[PDB]
Amino acid sequence: AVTQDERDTLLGQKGCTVWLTGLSASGKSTIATALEQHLLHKKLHAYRLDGDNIRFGLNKDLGFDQASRVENIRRIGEVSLLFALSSTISVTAFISPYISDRQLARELHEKHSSAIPFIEVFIDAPPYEAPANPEIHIRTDEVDVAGAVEIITKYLADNGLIPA
Amino acid sequence: AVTQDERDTLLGQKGCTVWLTGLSASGKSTIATALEQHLLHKKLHAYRLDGDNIRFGLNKDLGFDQASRVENIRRIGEVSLLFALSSTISVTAFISPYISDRQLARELHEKHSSAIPFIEVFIDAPPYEAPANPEIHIRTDEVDVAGAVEIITKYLADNGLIPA
């Protein structure tokens, strides 16, 4: 069976999870869609996990209580990890207001034997909790959508996940 | 946002699910791993969903009763569909003895607006129920692992999912 490093070598990319966090109307969703499209323009495998393809397929059994809300983030975290194991750039902007929401998903990635990168991206715009040391901090008052896509893509290239 | 046909065009492949069914020791698992490796050798995105990466991450909450067993196949069917939506050749040989097990997952694919192909592959070797009209019928007494990989790979090419 194929090893993780051989899969990445054969496919020309390393998998990871890009988790866009921020206020509900900060534009994280718009950036998530643009980032995906740009990476596909580079012929890189990238896939957006959002409420449409997840909330009513895999997660149709989940309601809206605290328990359902946490289980939703747990499942998304695990599915995101599977995509990253397949060498895909998994991108999500799913609602997740608490630091402990993103921490649940981060641990799944860092504790895995593949040590998959979890790239938390703060889309910071003018009861959400902000991240303390996010991998990437994008201030919306200074950068447009295309500039946020460029910063994220450059991070991926700089850290060896996609070709330069 | 990117459409399904644009994603396939940009990435050079169409997504699908290859569902290998047959007796537990028919070699379906060995074939699933060899098929994945061969497709990665062609630089095609392919990913195996199996008991290791699924049963103790996404599905760790499931036990071993009938209900848990059906929910397991349901979730695997849905995750497989997401992989196919990402333009990945999703491969599974998961335990699924009943015709109604494979039917649950097939409907998820055929009822989707992307009409994702569901490729049921009968690995037929000397209480499992066999498929009636499977997409591919491979007899183990006539074909070795590499020929079964070749038969399956040619089906994908012949049906427009991978380049010839």
Side-chain angles (χ1 to χ4, degrees), chain A residues 1-65 67-110 112-164, chain B residues 1-42 44-65 67-110 112-132 134-149 151-164:
Chain A
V2 62
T3 73
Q4 190 70 60
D5 294 340
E6 286 165 348
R7 187 196 294 280
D8 300 345
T9 299
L10 292 160
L11 291 176
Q13 47 180 126
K14 298 187 168 172
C16 61
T17 288
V18 187
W19 194 288
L20 287 78
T21 183
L23 293 169
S24 286
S26 67
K28 60 200 171 99
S29 184
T30 296
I31 297 173
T33 299
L35 171 62
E36 171 182 55
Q37 180 164 301
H38 183 58
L39 297 171
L40 297 172
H41 283 168
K42 302 170 63 78
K43 319 299 161 66
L44 294 165
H45 269 66
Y47 190 64
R48 201 176 82 257
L49 297 175
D50 62 71
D52 296 320
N53 60 347
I54 279 271
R55 194 58 181 73
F56 303 113
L58 186 58
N59 288 0
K60 65 165 64 145
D61 60 322
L62 299 185
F64 305 113
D65 50 328
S68 284
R69 187 196 73 81
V70 161
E71 174 65 6
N72 207 90
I73 293 165
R74 190 195 67 87
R75 294 191 195 179
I76 286 168
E78 292 277 17
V79 167
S80 201
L81 180 62
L82 294 171
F83 272 95
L85 296 169
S86 71
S87 303
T88 295
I89 318 293
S90 187
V91 182
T92 175
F94 210 85
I95 179 80
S96 42
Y98 305 111
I99 287 169
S100 66
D101 293 338
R102 284 103 60 182
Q103 186 64 36
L104 197 76
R106 178 182 292 278
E107 280 176 36
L108 298 177
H109 288 80
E110 301 184 339
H112 196 271
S113 66
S114 282
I116 297 291
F118 188 86
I119 301 174
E120 187 171 13
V121 177
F122 186 21
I123 306 300
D124 193 7
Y128 179 77
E129 309 177 334
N133 351 261
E135 275 71 18
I136 303 182
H137 191 171
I138 304 183
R139 280 166 213 76
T140 218
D141 38 310
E142 316 177 357
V143 191
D144 67 336
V145 167
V149 166
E150 189 185 5
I151 287 159
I152 300 174
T153 302
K154 169 89 165 61
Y155 182 97
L156 295 175
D158 286 352
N159 288 272
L161 311 175
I162 62 173
Chain B
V2 63
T3 74
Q4 191 69 58
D5 294 342
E6 286 164 347
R7 186 197 293 280
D8 301 347
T9 299
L10 290 159
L11 292 177
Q13 46 176 125
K14 297 188 168 172
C16 62
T17 288
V18 189
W19 195 288
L20 288 80
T21 185
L23 292 167
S24 287
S26 65
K28 61 201 173 100
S29 186
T30 296
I31 296 172
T33 299
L35 171 62
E36 172 184 56
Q37 180 161 301
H38 182 58
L39 292 170
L40 297 172
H41 284 166
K42 303 172 66 79
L44 293 165
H45 270 66
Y47 189 64
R48 198 176 79 256
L49 298 177
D50 60 71
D52 295 322
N53 58 347
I54 280 271
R55 195 60 182 74
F56 303 117
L58 184 55
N59 288 359
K60 63 160 64 87
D61 58 324
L62 299 185
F64 304 108
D65 52 330
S68 284
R69 186 196 73 82
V70 161
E71 174 67 7
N72 208 88
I73 293 164
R74 191 194 67 86
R75 295 191 198 177
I76 285 168
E78 292 275 17
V79 169
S80 202
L81 176 59
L82 295 169
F83 271 92
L85 296 169
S86 70
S87 304
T88 295
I89 318 294
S90 187
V91 182
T92 175
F94 211 88
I95 180 82
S96 41
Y98 305 111
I99 287 169
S100 65
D101 294 338
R102 283 104 59 182
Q103 186 65 36
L104 199 77
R106 178 183 292 279
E107 280 174 37
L108 299 176
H109 288 81
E110 301 184 338
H112 199 270
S113 64
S114 282
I116 296 290
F118 187 84
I119 301 173
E120 185 174 12
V121 179
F122 184 21
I123 304 299
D124 189 8
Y128 180 78
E129 311 177 335
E135 277 71 18
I136 303 181
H137 192 174
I138 305 184
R139 281 165 214 76
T140 277
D141 57 357
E142 313 179 356
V143 189
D144 67 338
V145 169
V149 166
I151 286 158
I152 300 176
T153 304
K154 168 160 192 53
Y155 182 97
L156 296 174
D158 284 351
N159 287 274
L161 308 176
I162 65 175

